[PDB]
Design an enzyme around this catalytic site. Structure first.
Site, short mmCIF file in Angstrom:
data_model
loop_
_atom_site.label_atom_id
_atom_site.label_comp_id
_atom_site.label_asym_id
_atom_site.label_seq_id
_atom_site.Cartn_x
_atom_site.Cartn_y
_atom_site.Cartn_z
N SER A 11 0.81 -1.21 0.00
CA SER A 11 0.00 0.00 0.00
C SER A 11 0.86 1.27 0.00
O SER A 11 1.68 1.45 -0.89
CB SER A 11 -0.96 -0.01 1.19
OG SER A 11 -2.10 0.79 0.93
N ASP B 261 -7.78 -5.26 -7.26
CA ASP B 261 -7.23 -4.33 -6.28
C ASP B 261 -7.44 -2.95 -6.91
O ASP B 261 -6.95 -2.68 -8.00
CB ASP B 261 -5.73 -4.61 -6.07
CG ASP B 261 -5.12 -3.79 -4.94
OD1 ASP B 261 -5.39 -2.57 -4.83
OD2 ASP B 261 -4.34 -4.38 -4.15
N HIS C 137 -7.17 -5.75 -1.97
CA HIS C 137 -6.05 -4.94 -1.52
C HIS C 137 -5.35 -5.47 -0.26
O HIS C 137 -4.16 -5.78 -0.27
CB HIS C 137 -6.55 -3.52 -1.27
CG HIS C 137 -5.50 -2.58 -0.77
ND1 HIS C 137 -4.46 -2.14 -1.57
CD2 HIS C 137 -5.33 -1.98 0.43
CE1 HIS C 137 -3.71 -1.30 -0.88
NE2 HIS C 137 -4.22 -1.19 0.33
#
Ligand SMILES: *[C@@H]1O[C@H](CO)[C@@H](O[C@@H]2O[C@H](CO)[C@@H](O)[C@H](O)[C@H]2NC(C)=O)[C@H](O)[C@H]1NC(C)=O
Length: 260
Positions: A133, A194, A247
């Site tokens: 991330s 994602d 994600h």
């Protein structure tokens, strides 16, 4: 721009660094026992958290950035303003993520003092920067900076946002041998739909780099596509929105915390 399937060794390295990125949300949980935990990376004004690891069995120095785990990290996430990557002149006409530049400038000295402190002992060791991330982008800005001085620098990212413009993309592509998948040292790993590597909007001049490794369910190496070139395909083609189950979990490992 697309082929299915990757070697096992390759898939295992990916699953291997994917385990270090998630482990960072906790306290470097059940990470490989071959690696030695080094100094903590911290700044309380941004809450950037990282680590310096060394594998005296593998011969590498690894820097791991924890992703978003606080509202302070969230304030760096939403800022989509572009700004000159003034720390690296080399990068001709580059501009990077606004909130991620705030974080990068807050740890650069720490990361570069801590990294040389280890390299100067093992000039032999290669440098590797990984993260998930926002941690993933932090690793990009870092790798880019570092690689201008050291040579053997690899980069593995997971759920990486668009950190920079095309000027920056083509800069990483040259410095990390993206020209071809047999020489790539920058692995931009994406998962299913994602929706994080889709932000910020490209209508704003943002752009991706590296070579895309697309993971589908079930995980597997047989189910990982090597995506390259420039057009719509793979993860970008699924159009995930933002922050979705795809994600948080990578290769079956959630950021939340340990289970590996
Ligand atoms: C949003 O991000 C921008 C871009 O980084 C921030 O402005 C930058 O601030 C740094 C120092 O913190 C300056 O050196 C840059 O020159 C600025 N860049 C730009 C685009 O001018 C800005 O502060 C952030 N906004 C908020 C509300 O945090």
């Amino acid at each position: 721009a697309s082929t299915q399937g990757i070697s096992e060794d390759l898939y295992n390295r990916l699953v291997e660094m994917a385990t270090i990125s998630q482990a960072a949300y906790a306290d470097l949980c059940n990470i490989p026992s071959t690696i030695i935990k080094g100094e903590k990376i911290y700044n309380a004004q941004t809450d950037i958290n990282g680590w310096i690891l060394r594998d005296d069995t593998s011969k590498e120095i690894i820097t791991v950035f924890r992703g978003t785990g606080s509202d302070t990290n969230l304030q760096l996430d939403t800022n989509y303003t572009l700004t000159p990557f003034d720390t690296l002149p080399q990068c001709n006409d580059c501009e990077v993520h606004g909130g991620y530049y705030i974080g990068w400038i807050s740890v650069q000295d720490q990361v570069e003092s801590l990294v040389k402190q280890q390299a100067s002992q093992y000039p032999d060791y290669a440098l590797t920067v990984t993260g998930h991330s926002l941690g993933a982008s932090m690793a990009a800005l870092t790798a880019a900076q570092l690689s201008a001085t050291y040579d053997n620098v690899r980069l593995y990212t997971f759920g990486e946002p668009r950190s920079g413009n095309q000027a920056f993309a083509s800069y990483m592509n040259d410095a990390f041998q993206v020209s071809s998948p047999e020489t790539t040292q920058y692995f931009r790993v994406t998962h299913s739909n994602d929706g994080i590597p889709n932000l910020p909007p490209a209508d704003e001049g943002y752009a991706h780099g590296g070579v895309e490794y697309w993971s589908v369910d079930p995980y597997s190496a047989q189910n990982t596509f090597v995506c390259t070139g420039d057009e719509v395909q793979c993860c970008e083609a699924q159009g995930g929105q933002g922050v979705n189950d795809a994600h948080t979990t990578y290769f079956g490992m959630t950021s939340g915390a340990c289970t590996w």
